């Protein structure tokens, strides 16, 4: 594959000449990637220090869980009163509750 | 530019590979930094320092 | 003739 | 110029070979002419002619 290697070398040289003419930096992307990889390494080092310090349980458990949109309001006692009344009425009629036990007194 | 693109395609060379890797690592930096700012908002600057 | 085909495509 | 140089390197072509040979032959002309001028200053224009 000497001839194909020679052609690949020639094509690389022509590409580099064209990039130089265009003022194109082929290695700029790799440079930015390497800098960002170093930044990832140092931020990850900070995170592993905080993890070794506080611990996996502490770091995982300080995760935020509250949000205003996720709150659930219950105020329809006017409806649940009638619901409970009908439940008790039908239970007594069907014979679930034969006697006025403390659970029936609590529901009352 | 067109001749350069032809030569790169012949050479099977990805001119955008470095940029793609950089954008991936930038997203990784962003998410690790988000984790760090969350830990800072939680414990505080004094505690973390 | 893969290499010569590649050269012909390049040209 | 850059593309021409790339093609010459690929072809194993020495663009400066002719100039180098010319400078060598020019030095040879210079030294042979120095010998001739010495012989002319020595025997004389009349004798040499």
Closest by Cα among A14, A31, D5, C4 to B11? A14
| Partners of residue C10 in chain A, C-beta under 8 Å | 11
How many distinct structural domains can be found in chain D? Answer: 1
- Separation of alpha carbons B22 and A64, rounded Å: 30
Q: Do D6 and A9 touch (CB under 8 A)?
A: no
The verdict on A8 touching D (C-beta cutoff 8 Å) is no
Long-range contacts of B36-39 (CB under 8 A, 24+ apart): B36/A43, B36/A46, B36/A47, B36/A50, B38/A64, B39/A47, B39/A50, B39/A59, B39/A62
D4 domain residue, yes or no: yes
Q: CA of C7 to nearest chain B CA: how many angstroms apart?
A: 8
B49 domain residue, yes or no: no
Handedness of CA A72, A75, A76, A81 (dihedral sign): positive
D20 domain residue, yes or no: yes
D38 domain residue, yes or no: yes
Residue A51 sits in a domain of what CATH number? Answer: 6.10.250.1930
- Separation of alpha carbons A11 and B11, rounded Å: 7
3-class secondary structure, A15: helix
Q: How far is CA B1 from CA A24, A30, A46, B35, C9, in A?
A: 9, 20, 43, 41, 18
For B34, the domain range is 1-44
Helices first, then strands: H and E counts in chain A: 5, 0
Please answer whether residues D2 and A17 qualify as being in contact, where contact means their C-beta atoms are separated by less than 8 angstroms: yes
- Separation of alpha carbons B48 and A14, rounded Å: 54
Query: How is residue A9 written in tokens?
Result: 């070398």
Q: Do A18 and B11 touch (CB under 8 A)?
A: no
Q: How far is CA A46 from CA A78, B8, B36, B43, B45, in A?
A: 55, 40, 8, 14, 14
């Amino acid at each position: 594959e000497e001839i194909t290697k020679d052609h690949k070398v020639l094509a690389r040289q022509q590409l580099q000449v064209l990039a130089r003419y265009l003022k194109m930096d082929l290695d700029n992307g790799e440079r930015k990637f390497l800098k960002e990889k170093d930044t990832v390494a140092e931020l990850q080092a900070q995170l592993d220090y905080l993890n070794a310090e506080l611990g996996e349980f502490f770091v995982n458990g300080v995760a935020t869980s509250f949000s205003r949109k996720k709150a659930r309001t219950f105020d329809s006692s006017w409806n649940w009163a009638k619901q409970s009344l009908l439940s008790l009425y039908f239970e007594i009629i069907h014979g679930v509750l034969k006697n006025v036990d403390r659970e029936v007194v609590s529901e009352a």
